[PDB]
Amino acid sequence: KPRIPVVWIHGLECTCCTESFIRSAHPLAKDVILSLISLDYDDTLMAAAGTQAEEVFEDIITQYNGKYILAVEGNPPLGEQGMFCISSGRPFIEKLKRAAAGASAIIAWGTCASWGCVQAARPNPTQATPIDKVITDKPIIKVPGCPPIPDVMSAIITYMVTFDRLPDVDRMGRPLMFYGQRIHDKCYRRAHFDAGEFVQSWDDDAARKGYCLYKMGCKGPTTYNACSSTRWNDGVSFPIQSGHGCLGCAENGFWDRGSFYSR
Amino acid sequence: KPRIPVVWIHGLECTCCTESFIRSAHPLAKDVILSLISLDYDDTLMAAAGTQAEEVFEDIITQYNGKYILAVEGNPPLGEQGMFCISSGRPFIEKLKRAAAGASAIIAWGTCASWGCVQAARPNPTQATPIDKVITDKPIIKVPGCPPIPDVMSAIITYMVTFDRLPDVDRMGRPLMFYGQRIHDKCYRRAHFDAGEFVQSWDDDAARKGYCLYKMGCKGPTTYNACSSTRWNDGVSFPIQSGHGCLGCAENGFWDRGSFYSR
Amino acid sequence: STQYETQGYTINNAGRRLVVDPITRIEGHMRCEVNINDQNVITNAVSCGTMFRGLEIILQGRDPRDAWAFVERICGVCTGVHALASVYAIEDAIGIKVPDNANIIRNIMLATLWCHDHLVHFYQLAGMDWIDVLDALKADPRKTSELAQSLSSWPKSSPGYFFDVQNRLKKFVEGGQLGIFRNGYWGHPQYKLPPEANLMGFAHYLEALDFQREIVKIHAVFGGKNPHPNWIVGGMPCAINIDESGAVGAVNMERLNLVQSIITRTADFINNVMIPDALAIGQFNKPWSEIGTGLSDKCVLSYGAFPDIANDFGEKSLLMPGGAVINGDFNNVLPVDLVDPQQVQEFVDHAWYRYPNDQVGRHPFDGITDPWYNPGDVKGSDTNIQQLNEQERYSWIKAPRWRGNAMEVGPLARTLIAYHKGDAATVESVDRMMSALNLPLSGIQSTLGRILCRAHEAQWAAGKLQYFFDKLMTNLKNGNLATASTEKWEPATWPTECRGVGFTEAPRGALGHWAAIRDGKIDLYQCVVPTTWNASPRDPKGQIGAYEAALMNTKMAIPEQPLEILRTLHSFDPCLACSTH
Amino acid sequence: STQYETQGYTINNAGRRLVVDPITRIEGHMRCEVNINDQNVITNAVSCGTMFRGLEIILQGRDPRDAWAFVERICGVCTGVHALASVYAIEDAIGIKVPDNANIIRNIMLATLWCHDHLVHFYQLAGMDWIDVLDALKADPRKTSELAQSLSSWPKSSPGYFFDVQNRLKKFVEGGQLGIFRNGYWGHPQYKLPPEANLMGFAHYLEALDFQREIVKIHAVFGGKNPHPNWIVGGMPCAINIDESGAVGAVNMERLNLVQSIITRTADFINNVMIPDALAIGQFNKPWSEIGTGLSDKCVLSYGAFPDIANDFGEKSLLMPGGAVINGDFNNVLPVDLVDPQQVQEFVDHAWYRYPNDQVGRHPFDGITDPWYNPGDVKGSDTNIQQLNEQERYSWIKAPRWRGNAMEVGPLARTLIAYHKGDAATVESVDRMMSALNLPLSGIQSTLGRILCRAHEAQWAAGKLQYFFDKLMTNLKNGNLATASTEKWEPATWPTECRGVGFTEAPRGALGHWAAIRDGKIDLYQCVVPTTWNASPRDPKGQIGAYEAALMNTKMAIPEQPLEILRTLHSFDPCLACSTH
Ligand code: SF4
Ligand code: SF4
Ligand code: FCO
Ligand code: FCO
Ligand code: SF3
Ligand code: SF3
Ligand code: F3S
Ligand code: F3S
Ligand SMILES: [Cl-]
């Protein structure tokens, strides 16, 4: 039986969300690609380059018009007529708009596509702009994080394929399943927060006992993600577990909320 | 290069601690047995039986007198002249005392060897008695839990082999590294406990959001172990993460502290 | 010395007496004695459970809701099966019906256990009776690769791999620290595998030791941990949330993905490693299709298991059939009723317990667990048993009978019941398996057969895991998420007095828990567990249990080296903590 | 059209122009244009970075302690290397010395990245340039098994496995949904592997895709997550506690055990899968030992990496050597000084930036990042480029030079430097590798060589992982637990004005971050990244960079199919986000 077509495009980005996806432990990214979806366009992985890649793009969005999922990593820059990000000699935004027009639904992978991420931090030299400020006539599912958790990304895909529906979202378009609660609402160091047991300098006795990172700048109290429950890399760790406060990396504007080490 | 001799004996027990040991993810139990220790006697796994197994036992404790670690799972019953647990036609306690006399140190695996566990629960029909009430002239490391965590068991072994010393212990003989803190001091649902956000009946809306299990009888606040940090089965879960309160299974007398579903 | 006849056997305690204590590569504590005649053939066999804990006594006065947690600790090998029987028993007493997803998840817990337990038994417990590990050092790695590739598609078969495994073993043994291999039976003439098959088997022993840890991740997801997962009366505690805020606090899509990944890997390992190894052991040890028959051609028992219709424990629901055969009449599979006082009864005339009348058997609702260590004259002392006195009390295991018949339980028993009830999958599998070995059907009724049936059950259970997972996902797709019924959670909702039976098929055979509740507390809790049946002592008629019967008439090559005894006992997968509880 | 001479090449832009945009199987955005003559030989090559973000502008005004987190997001492929360069730079500026364990753990983080990144590049990025995936459908599974087993001890080699892999591919393509394989170059005459080698390579592609996710578990233990782990100025935040209360809150023995397990599996996979595959690609594609030489026989550059003596970045400390070679004089490895204004300079006469004088280069302490999109007289228009004008500005990538020389960086560069400095392990590895291929040492100075050296380096780094791990454990055994220096954490302790350099060897080559701090805030932050060197545009002298040189003189079998262009470009492992930042 045919697999659901997926078109994955890349604007201004660092490719972290792509790398996160291939880390998926269950289902393995191999099995997602071979058995669950048809990954029909992807600059990172595809054999074809140049004019052969353009032909793939055109053929897929034409033959499966209205029927593919569009995954977007990165964002379009509005500076310099869009030519801060060039694909096939034209602004990236033209590729984004063409891809969007034929999509049944759009997944905005990562904080770049969802909100802006690092390139949109002050002073935003390229006028990098999130997808939902350019594409205003289509469902956008925001999957923020820098990058999002690997098994979150694959769980969202398996949900769409198994249940044949989009995940339910919050008012910001984030899947409720993984972004309904704050990091700090499921953090295993909350005991220490509640007791006033804080790391005050790196590698102090508090740090060696796993005390709370709030005084070292942890932004878990204002950050919605699954890092403190699902965790990272097949459950091995998350930022806080390995001794660094949450940066707030799933939240809009997190680079410009002051120093990561300040309250 | 010779490996440290280990003699593993079994009194009254259910064998859960042996099964836990073989679940180890890192190091694999395979590598522990082939490369880290010399598991020279073990009823569960050894080829030899009967007179052949008696010969192994006698030869190892004689050849390596003063130089083997004795691992004990289970406990001796004092009822019926010890014949509630029989080994080569004689009370288990005799084998325990023989093995103990030659050991350089003793690991008491599990709540059975440490404290008593289920056979010692009221009314303790067999007069099951923990190892440290019978063996009183040897270092005993208590590793409690029913069973202890697989990767905690293997971490203790690796520590002893790598560092050539026993773990430092609390006033009850439990390794500080994994028993220094309470389950509730590192529980990812502590946010909910602090907020008065509790499961009140199974599968209520609170349960489906991962709320605290205190009103369902969770004994995490008085239980010391690594379950909420290290977690179980290669970090996959622990009791509370899958929706059941902690029973208190690492603590002396936990079966007789009232219903697991009461305060 | 005396001789008497029972069940076609001549029980004769003349001749040399051999003692095997401890039995190793089992769970818990067992002693075995035999007598052998001048042809070194066993003419008398004595099964003895050398431990007792008293969970039936400890359970009195507990809250019924807590019972599962206590009785789970009957056994850490068959971990979870006593919890399942407990919640079934309490639910049967009170009159609780669980939601479909709870039933499905319970079936997943049980199938997961079957897979895990049967795999570890095959390699770590029984394997070294059939694989001469030291002989693997003589194997040619290329011929080993060739053998493995002829038997299986399994990837891990390169000559380099087998050389590396062999070299690991060589280095292990070279320093004289042979660990679990020390003072083994290596070189015994009953080891029949060629060196290449011994190296293949050893490599797989190590692969199975690694892989078995993964299987139980399913128990960690639904049950919190393994060993000894958690359960509730009323369903399971692992609440589900797929698509709502706070799914991070529940069984969600990522958790279910983990489960699916484990199921696939579990099927693949069993089908391409365990199954071919079991058939290879058969190919090289065909005479063991004629050794250790015991009661397997006379009397076998299954209660059945895996209710597919939630809260229905009838024949149309149970995916694993129940039934009894007696007197070797497999054309009449009889129905089993666990409430009927004339059916399951336990005797203690040959066990270390008191009854008011030790000549009668007690159904478990009339059961008594009053320990009485009384070995009589054992050619030593009460604290030095040199020879058990099998004319009197000789075990901590009670003697269960079914309508007064001594029965075998477990994988072979179950296979025979399903086969003779006309289960199509079972008929086709059994016929194909024995055809491949060029053996008659009767060859399954044997020590070899017990091993073959156990492996085929691991395959069966791995298939059922997928079926049950797909059933759960179908309910989730349809918005049916419920995992607990709590209408009768509070003791004020229970009958003042009620009783119930919880039953299933544990990896080793038919399991029942009989519970009576009064005034909110357990008044009586009696367990009859599969190894209790199989390892049973004798009864007032002198009838022998499954272990003693299977040992009868067995040739030993070398009396002092009990390999034949170990082979047959291990083929039943003895769990002594279960047997005695 | 014009023609001029530089670096032994004739740069001629007469004749047919080919455009490859987008370059795929790279990170980020690249455009490549070439001219080819009548003989289908490339006479001109144009490297264009088609993206820019401006991290150097974004860092102005930030707290130096935060800088690592921003610059880590230069790249999620080489994740962590910019964080390392950043903490080094800030520590250099302020005068901070980290504890030995922090240095060892940073070395572990970098070696982990080398292993991961190299492995994924080999299979997922470059592999399909060499392996004809559709041709694998024609292989014989037994001959594929025999080939694999002849090359490696790796276990997973059975005929049944290769058949299963083949059938998976067969099923994948059977519905006409070829996915990443659609409209590929399959069948092109430069595909030289036999069908069996193609199926072997494709199986390995899939095994590597699975296995790479494990390697980065080391990042998760010490750095919280991958991609994009966490770091601190002053060391690492992953406090250690082995034997004290609260070790559950820190890097403890169980966490270290997980790290060791990953290191062993990583070495095994690299040594027994990637290494033999690289050699096999060499065996079947020896003509590519003479294609794509570029600058690799003239000018190569390494800064060096992996300081083994904490806080000592000198020659006696760095385990991966630093040095420069120019004019093809490999007998003269020259010392590199990243503070010397006459050494590293960047030019922008052919890039989209403003300088006060674009005919001169600026050292990064004098760097300027003032974007200016000015493609000038293109064929087409500024928003619809048909042909870049390489006589003017044509790239978002600045042009770095070393003492005015155009250099190649990366694994081949490093290998040449270490070889010619007399590093015994490098000399042995290279000599053995080229002996196995029956190729001269010069054969490494090539497109094939870049791939062979990258595999070499993955092996090297996997060995170094164990070395660093052992060093860490040695400290812990001696009670040396410290992981951070905090005496200069607070801004008031810093110099009011200071500057520093942080450098290392990323997977793709020499990386440097130059930072100036004033009044507690970043005043200047300039990055010169390895792909900036290799993908460089031209300088005022017309000197071409490593990619343009390596493409020069290349034969194309089929002008419309850029396979040879892709092979050479992919051999450098382009990271375009890195190049432009
Ligand atoms: S470490 Fe961060 S998320 Fe966790 S309890 Fe402290 S402030 Fe909250
Ligand atoms: S679930 Fe138990 S351990 Fe966790 S916060 Fe609640 S009471 Fe404490
Ligand atoms: N299987 C098993 Fe254990 C036994 N006998 C139980 O029940
Ligand atoms: N490797 C790598 Fe990325 C590049 N170029 C950096 O630094
Ligand atoms: Fe995965 S591209 Fe990496 S920067 Fe923050 S989300 Fe963006
Ligand atoms: Fe591992 S034997 Fe299992 S009952 Fe509680 S620790 Fe005891
Ligand atoms: S920094 Fe990001 S990865 Fe999770 S813990 Fe905080 S949202
Ligand atoms: S029941 Fe035991 S396993 Fe851990 S969570 Fe509580 S100590
Ligand atoms: Cl794209």
Ligand SMILES: [Cl-]
């Ligand atoms: Cl943002």
Ligand SMILES: [Cl-]
């Ligand atoms: Cl023992």
Ligand SMILES: [Cl-]
């Ligand atoms: Cl206890």
Ligand SMILES: [Mg+2]
């Ligand atoms: Mg009983």
Ligand SMILES: [Mg+2]
């Ligand atoms: Mg720069």
Ligand code: NI
């Ligand atoms: Ni059992």
Ligand code: NI
């Ligand atoms: Ni990069």
